Design a protein around this ligand. Structure first.
Ligand SMILES: [Zn+2]
Ligand SMILES: [Zn+2]
Lengths: 154, 152
């Protein structure tokens, strides 16, 4: 088993992938994330407020990735190499300090790659049904908030 | 007198103000800053590559603020007080940690307000002629690089 929070954190990587698939590469940059219990907040850099249909799609695709039970692999390589093997996409808006010479990159094949040092579940199925509760688009900073919560079902 | 670097850092605040005056409020958020000797790099969040004429205006405007010899005031208030007194504009894209309950906000009336703890010149004139050398717009991240160097 996995703690609910380790579960919610993992959902973030899944939700991010769904976001990029639906909104495109322009929403590929993460600004920040927060997790509290079964609730999660993914803020990505974007330029508009997604339509209700797109939100639905992000949700659908995110839940489909959960059911596929895809593995969440975690490679540990040299900054330089990882830099060339995964490219710029493994990062967020905010750079991982340069004092760090070795990176732990989380990968969900064809979905999301991110230098992350936190604990993740071994597979996407271990996350469970995800529900997007609120979506806020902050015009000034041009950031998109995707609020979601995991579900106490089975 | 002031160190060349203290000068270049101060120019940052001046250049940022010129950038917002010319490009608008959408270029109001700073992503990062770098200063080495007489060289300075201001990266702001933006969506397009400014035209050559706009770059010229940013430069002009920036140098005119230098000649006005405006004072660079430095207020030190609680964070809750600066929050309401200067609003969100005093910040950058990345927030000053919440462990800091007292802020040092740099202000150049009607030009730029920024929570900054570094050393600044007492007035804009003490900066000197600014020259924008290169401007790079990185489409992926949507960031605009304003490269400039002081002349002294
Ligand atoms: Zn992670
Ligand atoms: Zn400063």
């Amino acid at each position: 088993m996995y703690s609910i929070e380790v579960r919610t954190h993992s959902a973030l990587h899944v939700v991010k992938g769904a976001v990029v698939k639906v909104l495109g590469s322009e929403a590929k940059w993460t600004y920040s994330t927060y997790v509290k219990g079964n609730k999660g907040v993914l803020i990505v850099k974007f330029d508009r407020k997604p339509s209700d249909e797109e939100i639905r799609e992000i949700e659908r695709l995110a839940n489909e990735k959960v059911k596929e039970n895809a593995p969440i692999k975690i490679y540990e390589l040299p900054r330089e190499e990882a830099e060339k093997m995964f490219g710029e996409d493994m990062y967020d808006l905010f750079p991982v300090p340069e004092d760090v010479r070795i990176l732990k990159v989380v990968v969900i094949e064809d979905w999301n790659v991110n230098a992350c040092n936190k604990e993740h579940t071994k597979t996407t199925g271990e996350i469970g049904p995800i529900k997007i509760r609120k979506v806020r688009f902050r015009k000034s900073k041009g950031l998109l908030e995707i609020h979601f919560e995991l579900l106490e079902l089975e």
